[PDB]
Amino acid sequence: APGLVVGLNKGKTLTKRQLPERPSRRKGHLSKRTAFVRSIVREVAGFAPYERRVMELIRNSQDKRARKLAKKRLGTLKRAKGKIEELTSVIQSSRLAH
Amino acid sequence: YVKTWFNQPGRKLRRRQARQTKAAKIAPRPVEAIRPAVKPPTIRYNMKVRAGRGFTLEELKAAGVSRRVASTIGIPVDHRRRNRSEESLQRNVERIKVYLAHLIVFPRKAGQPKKG
Amino acid sequence: LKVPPAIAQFQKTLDKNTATQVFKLLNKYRPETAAEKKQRLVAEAEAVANGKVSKKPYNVKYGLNHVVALIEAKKAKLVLIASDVDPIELVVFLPALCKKMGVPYAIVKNKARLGTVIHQKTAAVLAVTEVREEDKNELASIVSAVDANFSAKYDESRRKWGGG
Amino acid sequence: LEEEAVKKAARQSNKMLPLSAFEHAYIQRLINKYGTEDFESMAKDVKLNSKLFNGSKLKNLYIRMKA
Amino acid sequence: GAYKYLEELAKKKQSDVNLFLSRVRAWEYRQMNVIHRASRPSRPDKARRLGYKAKQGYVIYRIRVRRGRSARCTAEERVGRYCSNLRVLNSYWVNQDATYKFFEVILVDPSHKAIRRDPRINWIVNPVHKHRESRGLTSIGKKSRGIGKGHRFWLRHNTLSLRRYR
Amino acid sequence: EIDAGYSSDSSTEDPYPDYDDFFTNTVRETPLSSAPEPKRRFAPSKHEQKRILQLAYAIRKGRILTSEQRAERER
Amino acid sequence: SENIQKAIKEMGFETMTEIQKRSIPPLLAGRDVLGAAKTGSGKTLAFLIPTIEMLYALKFKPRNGTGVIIISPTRELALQIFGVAKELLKYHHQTFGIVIGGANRRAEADKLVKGVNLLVATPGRLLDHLQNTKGFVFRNLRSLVIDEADRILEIGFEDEMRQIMKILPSENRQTLLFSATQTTKVEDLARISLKPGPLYVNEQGYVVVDSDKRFLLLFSFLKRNLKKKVIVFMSSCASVKYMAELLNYIDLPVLDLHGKQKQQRRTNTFFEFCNAEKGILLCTNVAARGLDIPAVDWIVQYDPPDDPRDYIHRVGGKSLMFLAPSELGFLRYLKTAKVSLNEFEFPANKVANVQSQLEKLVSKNYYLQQSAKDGYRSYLQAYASYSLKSIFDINKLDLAKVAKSFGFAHPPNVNI
RNA sequence: AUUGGAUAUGCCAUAUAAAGCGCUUUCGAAGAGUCGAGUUGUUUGCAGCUCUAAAUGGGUGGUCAUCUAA
RNA sequence: UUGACCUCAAAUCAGGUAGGACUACGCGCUGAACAAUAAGCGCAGGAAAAGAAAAUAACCAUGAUUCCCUCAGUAACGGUGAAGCGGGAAAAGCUCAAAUUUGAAAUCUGGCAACAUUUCUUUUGUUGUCCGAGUUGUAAUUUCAA
């Protein structure tokens, strides 16, 4: 008969199961179209005044001052490190094109 | 402010009248939905078995009930819970299977056009 | 005032002669009106009610989401962008997206003129994706004209901050 | 309760469907050219399969025509 | 689609294109009224994801508030008072300058038949949604009173509960 | 070592550049979306067929005037 | 079981070949076998029938996970094996599947978590799934099959194969190994993978044509040689299916060794082609690997072969090679092989200018467009898996020109 | 007298339609003056001000687990 | 020029809607004294609010919200003072934005004309037609559980 016996136990035997990956855990993965959209917009929109100054320091090989300015503007190191890498590749792509 | 419990026997009667009111509307089906059997999430209680919220999708797939059919025959679905072990899967798959054995599903009339 | 190059490019529109020739091809491929669509469908309804297989339709593509998806799919042969979209950032990326996808594009005047082709008050962008075999040479000549009168022209001007 | 459920389900059991005038003429024309066993080539004929029904839809059309 | 490009362009708010448009439109909005009707949203991507549909019964209103309580909360309330027959759906930030913060508020007409016959916005017709912004039921209003799920976010502890058998 | 020194920046001791196309200088040759093409684009429209059956129904029920009898009513 | 026999007789397979004499009977007992056979001996049935028996014997189910893992060096060989295993499991319930390089990895993960009992894998992709994919149940692995072990070693999957054996369980698991040649690497891998004491079993013509004109030259050539016997070798079965379908759609009736991926139809088609005095047949290198070549006036290598060492021995009426200018480095390899060759010259005027009409036909038809994308994608993926990376470099290949040959105005979006 | 959910049954039914399950040599978009950083006030939350992001990223926890905000 | 579009206005134009009152309970804002305290101000309903995890945990794991009991006068803090688990009452899940319907804006308000319908001659719709809205995006489809 349908009935739940609450308390006591049911069984101490264990057998670990392998679980798949949930769709929500896929968030943050980069898409082929989102990467294209961002590359187009980044060129179209231009650069912020603080990104222009940071790009100037990287061009003059003053990376110590560039990283300091990015952190002072953005707030943390890993945000500054990511921005410097993004702007460095912009310079490299600009140099290859021009 | 001081809370008083003079309506304690009046809440008991009111809640029982709701169960009777609910049962009148849905005459032969149970007043509650079947709940899974889970184990509480602590080292103090993991030996006990209690009732869960709903059955996982992996438990329903094994039992043979789809997640869209399940809600219609009184089987709750918990999209959040998962089966990290084979004992939780089998303990609740059998619970669903026993439920289906004791269940009578009354047929529904279906619209049926002439041709096509 | 001083305007960025991505917004300055919208002040350099296609010339009157090329735009007039562009709309001669566009007006051959107008979508059927709400009335003409109803007449065609009711005509097929009587052929079904009593008792009884076509070709793919031909028309100009419109809609901002629709056209941008056609450019990304490289399905568009010619993209005509309105020059006076009220929020400019709606079409401010379209010349760059058309450059990236190799789509011949032009900035034409009077977004109202674009809407008239599609029986609408207003269209932000029109796109010709694929036309009949009779108009292959007419579209090809237009695309060559847009290359010279819009892409070969300006170009160096579109990379400069306008205004001031 | 159980007796009523089985008897009523038996009454409401006609699940197979007939074909309309268009459905019958559609499937009949496909069969007359490609036989009755080759449904994969039946779906790939653009002229007769205008609606682009796949082999599984055409198979279900033929089955409903048999009964 | 074009709302992918519009919404990624809205993250670069101080880029060349966005800075020029911020300063040009901020001057334009200052010549208008404090609260003025908007023919169409200045951010069609942001309004669209906040519940706005380009159909009859949906209204966009712009309002400027002085910088220096929540700025967005006051914009919702001021517009709600200005249009007393509409329901404030949501609101968002469009522009700012050294003095003013500009917001656009999405309102819905609970009396229009295109609203009352649409099941997806039918809920706002019920009287329980009268002046949602006034009771802190909007997105910024809920955030203002710290409503949320988690440890990051009275009466039942200042009272003595005396049972019948105690 | 980092010498624990100072770099003269620590607190203790073109305004209008030209447009630069660093991404759109080249042309992408392939479509952006790799999703398969649905069959709906190679088959007659199902939206219109829905309306045709709906119109054909109301023609039988007499809700909509047919083209032949539309002209007769006009004259 | 009867289900095995009912499936086997569907393929039209009777009696039993020589290599299976020392492999099929002993392998049915669950003992490790070190097979060694040449090309075309029929090893596909050798390591599939006993393993399929063992799936039925243990009553495996998708909840149990993968029980048999078959490793193949190339996409085409793995796909051909997967097609055969599908035929053998026609009357079964044990799930089967294939994971290959360059395929949809996300889609493969969704299929692996559901439970694939018979998995056909490639060394590159299997290691990726065995390390990263979650929910892939393989703790119940019971049989392991390696086909063309020498080919795997020469490709450069020695490191990948080592991690596979270290990750996959070794206890109570049957293992296999098949290699045409026994080298030091093959013997070393067998010693570290196979169980101790195993049962051991034992003139050229080319045309320098650009990619965009590859099909147009081919079509014009076939029109000219309609009164002869033509056999064309392709790099994939999907490429075979599309070109065969397209050629029949432009009033050039041809035959293909694809059919509907039915083994009986391929034998019937080959038998009809051999019997017929005149005709044209299309097939891939793997399908024709080990088969008996009839008296054919023209043999055409439309796509470069993936095994140049085997191809140069197979050739030894007239031979043709459709070599792109970027593939001219293969000419130098021919000199090192000491094979006489001559260059074929063709006039651009005589080439059919039907490319514009070809694109219109492909775009208008749903199934032609679908086949064209599958053929183009598979041809590129087979190209990226070539052994001669220096000669047949995919990066040097012009993708815009290649897609023109398939009837595409623009290169479709295919990954790798 | 006014009503609600069912049952039975007649008629009508635009089904060339619409679904669930199953399988993959094909794909899979996810919310910004926000998150966050500094600082100043109200009672950690909230608020102002200055600055201002990311894409297996981000949040919260104990390399791992869990969650998927605006 | 005609003429479309965008504006800016006007009308004793048509159809609507807001105010004030109550305020025991409810949700915001504000605030002294002897504390989210009274007051002051704003806004609802028959309940309100909250609500389908950017939640807990460290387990054999749990599974929206709300309320009760317990945890507990405990941890923590500097006398204040929770929460996870656990036991109950009740249980129900979902909707968008971000995808090309593109082989066909498939969507919607209104006017008018008929046909119905009513707690009701007072109510609420249907069908047809025209106009408008809408491609600067209305339907179908999708919401990560996919």
PDB file of N, CA, C and O in Angstrom, chain C residues 93-145:
ATOM      1  N   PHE C  93      25.772  50.516 -35.906  1.00  0.00           N
ATOM      2  CA  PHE C  93      26.657  49.385 -36.142  1.00  0.00           C
ATOM      3  C   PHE C  93      26.483  48.772 -37.522  1.00  0.00           C
ATOM      4  O   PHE C  93      27.343  47.997 -37.950  1.00  0.00           O
ATOM      5  N   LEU C  94      25.392  49.091 -38.215  1.00  0.00           N
ATOM      6  CA  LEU C  94      25.088  48.431 -39.483  1.00  0.00           C
ATOM      7  C   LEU C  94      26.159  48.651 -40.543  1.00  0.00           C
ATOM      8  O   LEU C  94      26.520  47.678 -41.226  1.00  0.00           O
ATOM      9  N   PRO C  95      26.687  49.862 -40.762  1.00  0.00           N
ATOM     10  CA  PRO C  95      27.795  49.987 -41.722  1.00  0.00           C
ATOM     11  C   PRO C  95      29.007  49.148 -41.363  1.00  0.00           C
ATOM     12  O   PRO C  95      29.689  48.643 -42.260  1.00  0.00           O
ATOM     13  N   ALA C  96      29.302  48.989 -40.073  1.00  0.00           N
ATOM     14  CA  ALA C  96      30.438  48.165 -39.674  1.00  0.00           C
ATOM     15  C   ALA C  96      30.133  46.683 -39.841  1.00  0.00           C
ATOM     16  O   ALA C  96      30.995  45.913 -40.278  1.00  0.00           O
ATOM     17  N   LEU C  97      28.919  46.263 -39.487  1.00  0.00           N
ATOM     18  CA  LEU C  97      28.530  44.872 -39.692  1.00  0.00           C
ATOM     19  C   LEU C  97      28.495  44.527 -41.174  1.00  0.00           C
ATOM     20  O   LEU C  97      28.866  43.417 -41.567  1.00  0.00           O
ATOM     21  N   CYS C  98      28.049  45.465 -42.011  1.00  0.00           N
ATOM     22  CA  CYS C  98      28.038  45.222 -43.449  1.00  0.00           C
ATOM     23  C   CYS C  98      29.453  45.176 -44.015  1.00  0.00           C
ATOM     24  O   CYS C  98      29.721  44.436 -44.967  1.00  0.00           O
ATOM     25  N   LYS C  99      30.369  45.971 -43.459  1.00  0.00           N
ATOM     26  CA  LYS C  99      31.764  45.887 -43.876  1.00  0.00           C
ATOM     27  C   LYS C  99      32.375  44.547 -43.488  1.00  0.00           C
ATOM     28  O   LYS C  99      33.145  43.962 -44.257  1.00  0.00           O
ATOM     29  N   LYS C 100      32.050  44.052 -42.292  1.00  0.00           N
ATOM     30  CA  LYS C 100      32.635  42.805 -41.814  1.00  0.00           C
ATOM     31  C   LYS C 100      32.128  41.612 -42.609  1.00  0.00           C
ATOM     32  O   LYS C 100      32.871  40.651 -42.837  1.00  0.00           O
ATOM     33  N   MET C 101      30.871  41.648 -43.033  1.00  0.00           N
ATOM     34  CA  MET C 101      30.261  40.539 -43.750  1.00  0.00           C
ATOM     35  C   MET C 101      30.377  40.672 -45.260  1.00  0.00           C
ATOM     36  O   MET C 101      29.891  39.798 -45.981  1.00  0.00           O
ATOM     37  N   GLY C 102      31.010  41.728 -45.755  1.00  0.00           N
ATOM     38  CA  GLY C 102      31.137  41.924 -47.188  1.00  0.00           C
ATOM     39  C   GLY C 102      29.823  42.164 -47.895  1.00  0.00           C
ATOM     40  O   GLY C 102      29.622  41.666 -49.008  1.00  0.00           O
ATOM     41  N   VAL C 103      28.922  42.917 -47.277  1.00  0.00           N
ATOM     42  CA  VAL C 103      27.605  43.207 -47.835  1.00  0.00           C
ATOM     43  C   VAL C 103      27.643  44.606 -48.436  1.00  0.00           C
ATOM     44  O   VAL C 103      27.938  45.568 -47.711  1.00  0.00           O
ATOM     45  N   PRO C 104      27.379  44.769 -49.732  1.00  0.00           N
ATOM     46  CA  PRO C 104      27.268  46.119 -50.298  1.00  0.00           C
ATOM     47  C   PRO C 104      26.141  46.887 -49.630  1.00  0.00           C
ATOM     48  O   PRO C 104      24.989  46.457 -49.633  1.00  0.00           O
ATOM     49  N   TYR C 105      26.482  48.032 -49.053  1.00  0.00           N
ATOM     50  CA  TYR C 105      25.533  48.813 -48.277  1.00  0.00           C
ATOM     51  C   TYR C 105      25.606  50.276 -48.684  1.00  0.00           C
ATOM     52  O   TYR C 105      26.614  50.750 -49.212  1.00  0.00           O
ATOM     53  N   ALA C 106      24.513  50.988 -48.426  1.00  0.00           N
ATOM     54  CA  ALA C 106      24.439  52.414 -48.690  1.00  0.00           C
ATOM     55  C   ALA C 106      23.555  53.063 -47.640  1.00  0.00           C
ATOM     56  O   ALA C 106      22.655  52.427 -47.089  1.00  0.00           O
ATOM     57  N   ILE C 107      23.825  54.332 -47.364  1.00  0.00           N
ATOM     58  CA  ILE C 107      23.008  55.137 -46.466  1.00  0.00           C
ATOM     59  C   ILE C 107      22.171  56.063 -47.334  1.00  0.00           C
ATOM     60  O   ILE C 107      22.702  56.964 -47.989  1.00  0.00           O
ATOM     61  N   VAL C 108      20.864  55.841 -47.350  1.00  0.00           N
ATOM     62  CA  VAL C 108      19.967  56.603 -48.185  1.00  0.00           C
ATOM     63  C   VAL C 108      19.191  57.583 -47.315  1.00  0.00           C
ATOM     64  O   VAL C 108      19.165  57.480 -46.092  1.00  0.00           O
ATOM     65  N   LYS C 109      18.543  58.546 -47.956  1.00  0.00           N
ATOM     66  CA  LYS C 109      17.865  59.631 -47.268  1.00  0.00           C
ATOM     67  C   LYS C 109      16.397  59.287 -47.038  1.00  0.00           C
ATOM     68  O   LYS C 109      15.818  58.444 -47.726  1.00  0.00           O
ATOM     69  N   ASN C 110      15.797  59.961 -46.054  1.00  0.00           N
ATOM     70  CA  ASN C 110      14.363  59.853 -45.812  1.00  0.00           C
ATOM     71  C   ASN C 110      13.906  58.436 -45.497  1.00  0.00           C
ATOM     72  O   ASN C 110      13.376  57.745 -46.369  1.00  0.00           O
ATOM     73  N   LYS C 111      14.167  57.979 -44.275  1.00  0.00           N
ATOM     74  CA  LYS C 111      13.601  56.739 -43.750  1.00  0.00           C
ATOM     75  C   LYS C 111      12.126  56.575 -44.118  1.00  0.00           C
ATOM     76  O   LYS C 111      11.627  55.450 -44.194  1.00  0.00           O
ATOM     77  N   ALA C 112      11.412  57.688 -44.320  1.00  0.00           N
ATOM     78  CA  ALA C 112      10.043  57.614 -44.820  1.00  0.00           C
ATOM     79  C   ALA C 112       9.990  57.017 -46.222  1.00  0.00           C
ATOM     80  O   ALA C 112       9.077  56.247 -46.538  1.00  0.00           O
ATOM     81  N   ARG C 113      10.952  57.369 -47.082  1.00  0.00           N
ATOM     82  CA  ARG C 113      11.000  56.780 -48.418  1.00  0.00           C
ATOM     83  C   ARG C 113      11.171  55.271 -48.349  1.00  0.00           C
ATOM     84  O   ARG C 113      10.589  54.535 -49.152  1.00  0.00           O
ATOM     85  N   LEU C 114      11.993  54.794 -47.413  1.00  0.00           N
ATOM     86  CA  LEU C 114      12.154  53.357 -47.233  1.00  0.00           C
ATOM     87  C   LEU C 114      10.848  52.711 -46.793  1.00  0.00           C
ATOM     88  O   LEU C 114      10.499  51.623 -47.261  1.00  0.00           O
ATOM     89  N   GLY C 115      10.115  53.366 -45.893  1.00  0.00           N
ATOM     90  CA  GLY C 115       8.845  52.825 -45.448  1.00  0.00           C
ATOM     91  C   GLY C 115       7.801  52.761 -46.542  1.00  0.00           C
ATOM     92  O   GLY C 115       6.958  51.862 -46.546  1.00  0.00           O
ATOM     93  N   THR C 116       7.828  53.715 -47.473  1.00  0.00           N
ATOM     94  CA  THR C 116       6.852  53.725 -48.556  1.00  0.00           C
ATOM     95  C   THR C 116       6.990  52.499 -49.449  1.00  0.00           C
ATOM     96  O   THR C 116       5.992  52.009 -49.990  1.00  0.00           O
ATOM     97  N   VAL C 117       8.210  51.980 -49.604  1.00  0.00           N
ATOM     98  CA  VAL C 117       8.415  50.787 -50.421  1.00  0.00           C
ATOM     99  C   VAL C 117       7.688  49.595 -49.815  1.00  0.00           C
ATOM    100  O   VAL C 117       7.167  48.736 -50.533  1.00  0.00           O
ATOM    101  N   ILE C 118       7.634  49.527 -48.491  1.00  0.00           N
ATOM    102  CA  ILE C 118       7.084  48.376 -47.795  1.00  0.00           C
ATOM    103  C   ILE C 118       5.682  48.659 -47.255  1.00  0.00           C
ATOM    104  O   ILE C 118       5.190  47.922 -46.404  1.00  0.00           O
ATOM    105  N   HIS C 119       5.030  49.714 -47.745  1.00  0.00           N
ATOM    106  CA  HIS C 119       3.686  50.095 -47.311  1.00  0.00           C
ATOM    107  C   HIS C 119       3.628  50.339 -45.806  1.00  0.00           C
ATOM    108  O   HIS C 119       2.664  49.973 -45.134  1.00  0.00           O
ATOM    109  N   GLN C 120       4.670  50.965 -45.274  1.00  0.00           N
ATOM    110  CA  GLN C 120       4.738  51.320 -43.866  1.00  0.00           C
ATOM    111  C   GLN C 120       5.061  52.802 -43.746  1.00  0.00           C
ATOM    112  O   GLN C 120       5.567  53.423 -44.681  1.00  0.00           O
ATOM    113  N   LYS C 121       4.748  53.371 -42.583  1.00  0.00           N
ATOM    114  CA  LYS C 121       5.081  54.769 -42.351  1.00  0.00           C
ATOM    115  C   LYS C 121       6.584  54.995 -42.344  1.00  0.00           C
ATOM    116  O   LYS C 121       7.053  56.068 -42.735  1.00  0.00           O
ATOM    117  N   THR C 122       7.348  53.996 -41.917  1.00  0.00           N
ATOM    118  CA  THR C 122       8.744  54.181 -41.558  1.00  0.00           C
ATOM    119  C   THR C 122       9.461  52.842 -41.582  1.00  0.00           C
ATOM    120  O   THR C 122       8.927  51.840 -41.103  1.00  0.00           O
ATOM    121  N   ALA C 123      10.668  52.835 -42.141  1.00  0.00           N
ATOM    122  CA  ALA C 123      11.550  51.678 -42.098  1.00  0.00           C
ATOM    123  C   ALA C 123      12.960  52.144 -41.786  1.00  0.00           C
ATOM    124  O   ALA C 123      13.460  53.078 -42.417  1.00  0.00           O
ATOM    125  N   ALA C 124      13.597  51.494 -40.815  1.00  0.00           N
ATOM    126  CA  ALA C 124      14.963  51.846 -40.453  1.00  0.00           C
ATOM    127  C   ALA C 124      15.980  51.320 -41.456  1.00  0.00           C
ATOM    128  O   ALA C 124      17.010  51.964 -41.675  1.00  0.00           O
ATOM    129  N   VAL C 125      15.728  50.164 -42.062  1.00  0.00           N
ATOM    130  CA  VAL C 125      16.670  49.584 -43.011  1.00  0.00           C
ATOM    131  C   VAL C 125      15.904  48.664 -43.950  1.00  0.00           C
ATOM    132  O   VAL C 125      14.983  47.958 -43.537  1.00  0.00           O
ATOM    133  N   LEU C 126      16.285  48.693 -45.223  1.00  0.00           N
ATOM    134  CA  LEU C 126      15.783  47.779 -46.234  1.00  0.00           C
ATOM    135  C   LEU C 126      16.932  46.910 -46.718  1.00  0.00           C
ATOM    136  O   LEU C 126      18.091  47.326 -46.697  1.00  0.00           O
ATOM    137  N   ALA C 127      16.611  45.695 -47.151  1.00  0.00           N
ATOM    138  CA  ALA C 127      17.629  44.765 -47.622  1.00  0.00           C
ATOM    139  C   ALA C 127      17.075  43.959 -48.781  1.00  0.00           C
ATOM    140  O   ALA C 127      16.001  43.366 -48.669  1.00  0.00           O
ATOM    141  N   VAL C 128      17.811  43.935 -49.883  1.00  0.00           N
ATOM    142  CA  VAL C 128      17.486  43.086 -51.020  1.00  0.00           C
ATOM    143  C   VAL C 128      18.332  41.827 -50.908  1.00  0.00           C
ATOM    144  O   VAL C 128      19.565  41.891 -50.966  1.00  0.00           O
ATOM    145  N   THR C 129      17.678  40.681 -50.739  1.00  0.00           N
ATOM    146  CA  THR C 129      18.390  39.427 -50.538  1.00  0.00           C
ATOM    147  C   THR C 129      18.601  38.642 -51.820  1.00  0.00           C
ATOM    148  O   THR C 129      19.703  38.141 -52.050  1.00  0.00           O
ATOM    149  N   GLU C 130      17.577  38.509 -52.658  1.00  0.00           N
ATOM    150  CA  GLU C 130      17.715  37.710 -53.872  1.00  0.00           C
ATOM    151  C   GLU C 130      16.540  38.015 -54.784  1.00  0.00           C
ATOM    152  O   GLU C 130      15.385  37.906 -54.363  1.00  0.00           O
ATOM    153  N   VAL C 131      16.835  38.413 -56.019  1.00  0.00           N
ATOM    154  CA  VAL C 131      15.836  38.927 -56.941  1.00  0.00           C
ATOM    155  C   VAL C 131      15.673  37.954 -58.104  1.00  0.00           C
ATOM    156  O   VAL C 131      16.392  36.963 -58.225  1.00  0.00           O
ATOM    157  N   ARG C 132      14.708  38.253 -58.970  1.00  0.00           N
ATOM    158  CA  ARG C 132      14.424  37.392 -60.105  1.00  0.00           C
ATOM    159  C   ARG C 132      15.564  37.439 -61.117  1.00  0.00           C
ATOM    160  O   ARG C 132      16.395  38.348 -61.115  1.00  0.00           O
ATOM    161  N   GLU C 133      15.593  36.433 -61.992  1.00  0.00           N
ATOM    162  CA  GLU C 133      16.651  36.346 -62.990  1.00  0.00           C
ATOM    163  C   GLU C 133      16.625  37.516 -63.963  1.00  0.00           C
ATOM    164  O   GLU C 133      17.665  37.858 -64.533  1.00  0.00           O
ATOM    165  N   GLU C 134      15.461  38.137 -64.163  1.00  0.00           N
ATOM    166  CA  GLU C 134      15.373  39.285 -65.057  1.00  0.00           C
ATOM    167  C   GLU C 134      16.129  40.487 -64.512  1.00  0.00           C
ATOM    168  O   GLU C 134      16.668  41.283 -65.288  1.00  0.00           O
ATOM    169  N   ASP C 135      16.174  40.640 -63.192  1.00  0.00           N
ATOM    170  CA  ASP C 135      16.762  41.807 -62.555  1.00  0.00           C
ATOM    171  C   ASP C 135      18.165  41.550 -62.025  1.00  0.00           C
ATOM    172  O   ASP C 135      18.673  42.356 -61.240  1.00  0.00           O
ATOM    173  N   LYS C 136      18.799  40.446 -62.421  1.00  0.00           N
ATOM    174  CA  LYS C 136      20.155  40.176 -61.959  1.00  0.00           C
ATOM    175  C   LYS C 136      21.121  41.251 -62.435  1.00  0.00           C
ATOM    176  O   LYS C 136      21.991  41.693 -61.678  1.00  0.00           O
ATOM    177  N   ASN C 137      20.982  41.686 -63.689  1.00  0.00           N
ATOM    178  CA  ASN C 137      21.873  42.715 -64.216  1.00  0.00           C
ATOM    179  C   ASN C 137      21.556  44.083 -63.625  1.00  0.00           C
ATOM    180  O   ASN C 137      22.463  44.895 -63.410  1.00  0.00           O
ATOM    181  N   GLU C 138      20.277  44.364 -63.373  1.00  0.00           N
ATOM    182  CA  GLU C 138      19.910  45.644 -62.780  1.00  0.00           C
ATOM    183  C   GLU C 138      20.432  45.762 -61.354  1.00  0.00           C
ATOM    184  O   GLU C 138      20.940  46.817 -60.959  1.00  0.00           O
ATOM    185  N   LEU C 139      20.313  44.693 -60.565  1.00  0.00           N
ATOM    186  CA  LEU C 139      20.884  44.708 -59.222  1.00  0.00           C
ATOM    187  C   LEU C 139      22.407  44.746 -59.271  1.00  0.00           C
ATOM    188  O   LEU C 139      23.040  45.432 -58.463  1.00  0.00           O
ATOM    189  N   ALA C 140      23.012  44.015 -60.208  1.00  0.00           N
ATOM    190  CA  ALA C 140      24.466  44.009 -60.313  1.00  0.00           C
ATOM    191  C   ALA C 140      25.001  45.387 -60.673  1.00  0.00           C
ATOM    192  O   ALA C 140      26.049  45.805 -60.170  1.00  0.00           O
ATOM    193  N   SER C 141      24.304  46.101 -61.559  1.00  0.00           N
ATOM    194  CA  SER C 141      24.725  47.453 -61.912  1.00  0.00           C
ATOM    195  C   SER C 141      24.572  48.403 -60.732  1.00  0.00           C
ATOM    196  O   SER C 141      25.397  49.302 -60.542  1.00  0.00           O
ATOM    197  N   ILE C 142      23.516  48.226 -59.940  1.00  0.00           N
ATOM    198  CA  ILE C 142      23.317  49.058 -58.757  1.00  0.00           C
ATOM    199  C   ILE C 142      24.418  48.810 -57.733  1.00  0.00           C
ATOM    200  O   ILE C 142      24.949  49.752 -57.134  1.00  0.00           O
ATOM    201  N   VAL C 143      24.776  47.545 -57.515  1.00  0.00           N
ATOM    202  CA  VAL C 143      25.819  47.217 -56.548  1.00  0.00           C
ATOM    203  C   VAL C 143      27.155  47.807 -56.981  1.00  0.00           C
ATOM    204  O   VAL C 143      27.946  48.267 -56.150  1.00  0.00           O
ATOM    205  N   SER C 144      27.430  47.807 -58.286  1.00  0.00           N
ATOM    206  CA  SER C 144      28.644  48.453 -58.774  1.00  0.00           C
ATOM    207  C   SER C 144      28.579  49.962 -58.584  1.00  0.00           C
ATOM    208  O   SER C 144      29.593  50.597 -58.275  1.00  0.00           O
ATOM    209  N   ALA C 145      27.399  50.556 -58.776  1.00  0.00           N
ATOM    210  CA  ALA C 145      27.250  51.990 -58.555  1.00  0.00           C
ATOM    211  C   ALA C 145      27.418  52.346 -57.084  1.00  0.00           C
ATOM    212  O   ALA C 145      28.054  53.352 -56.754  1.00  0.00           O
TER     213      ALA C 145
END
